[PDB]
Amino acid sequence: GLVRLPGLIDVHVHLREPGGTHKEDFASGTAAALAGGITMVCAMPNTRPPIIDAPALALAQKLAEAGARCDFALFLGALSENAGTLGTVAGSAAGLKLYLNETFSELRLDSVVQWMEHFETWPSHLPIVAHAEQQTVAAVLMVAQLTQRSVHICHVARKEEILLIKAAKARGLPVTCEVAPHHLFLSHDDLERLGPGKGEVRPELGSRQDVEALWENMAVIDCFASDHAPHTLEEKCGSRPPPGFPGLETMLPLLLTAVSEGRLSLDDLLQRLHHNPRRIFHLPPQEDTYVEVDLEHEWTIPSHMPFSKAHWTPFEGQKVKGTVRRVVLRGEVAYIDGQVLVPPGYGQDVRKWPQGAVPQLP
Numbered sequence: 001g002l003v004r005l006p007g008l009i010d011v012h013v014h015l016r017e018p019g020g021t022h023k024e025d026f027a028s029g030t031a032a033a034l035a036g037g038i039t040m041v042c043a044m045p046n047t048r049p050p051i052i053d054a055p056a057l058a059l060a061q062k063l064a065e066a067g068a069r070c071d072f073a074l075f076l077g078a079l080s081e082n083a084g085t086l087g088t089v090a091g092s093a094a095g096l097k098l099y100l101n102e103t104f105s106e107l108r109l110d111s112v113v114q115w116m117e118h119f120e121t122w123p124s125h126l127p128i129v130a131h132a133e134q135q136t137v138a139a140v141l142m143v144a145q146l147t148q149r150s151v152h153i154c155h156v157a158r159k160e161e162i163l164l165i166k167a168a169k170a171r172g173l174p175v176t177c178e179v180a181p182h183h184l185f186l187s188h189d190d191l192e193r194l195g196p197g198k199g200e201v202r203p204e205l206g207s208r209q210d211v212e213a214l215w216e217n218m219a220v221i222d223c224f225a226s227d228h229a230p231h232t233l234e235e236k237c238g239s240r241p242p243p244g245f246p247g248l249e250t251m252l253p254l255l256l257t258a259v260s261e262g263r264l265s266l267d268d269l270l271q272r273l274h275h276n277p278r279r280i281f282h283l284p285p286q287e288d289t290y291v292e293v294d295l296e297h298e299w300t301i302p303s304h305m306p307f308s309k310a311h312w313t314p315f316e317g318q319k320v321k322g323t324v325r326r327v328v329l330r331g332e333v334a335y336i337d338g339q340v341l342v343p344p345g346y347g348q349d350v351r352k353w354p355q356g357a358v359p360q361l362p
């Protein structure tokens with residue numbers, strides 16, 4: 001007895017093309033998405049070249065249209081000197097990403113004044129998302145208030161962060177957030193097994209109290225998003241390990257296991273992987289699109305999942321209950337039981353669909 005789910009949406013993935021294609025490309029990363037029950041992804045802009053102007057966006061659009069197997073939208077990235085220059089292309093992007101802390105990015109902003117300049121110049125009806133850890137969450141919320149608009153907080157990982165967001169929502173402030181599976185299912189207790197290279201991620205893995213606080217405050221979490229951040233094992237275990245975990249192929253199995261245990265409901269999962277992504281990012285429906293899952297099948301996560309070029313996973317050894325059996329995307333069988341059945345290039349840029357433009361006042 002399979003359960004039919006709508007097409008799930010991951011609003012935070014790194015597909016590494018252009019410029020990091022040994023780690024992942026559009027074709028391999030979207031294969032990983034489909035195998036994880038994800039039919040639409042929003043790809044981050046910290047590529048090489050980074051997606052920080054109209055020419056880079058045009059390149060990335062063509063690479064994605066040629067390589068993606070599922071549908072997508074592409075983020076633009078903020079830089080210290082590109083505020084006020086993105087207006088002609090802003091509506092074609094998923095949103096604008098701000099990198100406000102140290103991480104795997106060359107995009108960090110130098111001054112809160114540059115955050116203000118972006119919030120003032122980026123069109124007010126279009127999404128802004130931020131990598132903002134600890135007190136940076138409070139700082140970016142202040143900038144959003146000064147400029148009288150909303151903000152979405154990426155990968156919330158700490159008790160401190162979720163309680164600050166909770167307090168802001170209680171005051172009626174327009175803030176949303178997402179949580180990644182590693183911050184729900186891994187902690188400091190896993191660092192001995194992972195070791196110091198594999199364990200590198202931003203935000204870093206939290207304490208048991210951080211993990212417990214995210215679960216206790218599920219009502220505050222608007223979305224789940226993988227922050228799929230593939231790097232090869234050689235890179236993770238070398239002299240200067242980059243932070244990040246692959247996650248597309250493991251996210252839905254981990255969350256289905258939690259549903260089976262009664263830790264959240266099926267509806268709670270679908271709000272966070274379908275309805276709230278749609279409404280926060282103004283992403284369009286996908287016609288004739290659904291995911292069939294088997295909630296009974298028990299399995300153990302192996303040392304690498306089949307599709308991601310990262311070829312490793314921090315969830316190795318965890319026992320899960322739930323698997324993706326079939327995905328149909330826009331009327332075509334896209335995935336069955338380990339086989340991807342749509343070619344590179346089947347996926348489309350949802351921002352080019354009439355229904356994928358963000359409504360605005362004239």
Ligand SMILES: NC(=O)N[C@@H](CC(=O)O)C(=O)O
Pocket residue numbers: 014046103104105131200201202203227229230242243244245
């Ligand atoms: N989270 C990470 O540790 N790494 C991400 C970047 C990010 O989401 O900050 C990556 O692109 O590798």
Ligand SMILES: [Zn+2]
Pocket residue numbers: 103131154155202203
């Ligand atoms: Zn980040």
Ligand SMILES: [Zn+2]
Pocket residue numbers: 011012129153154155178225
């Ligand atoms: Zn994000």
Ligand SMILES: [Zn+2]
Pocket residue numbers: 012013014044227229
């Ligand atoms: Zn990221």
Ligand SMILES: [Zn+2]
Pocket residue numbers: 270275
């Ligand atoms: Zn529904």
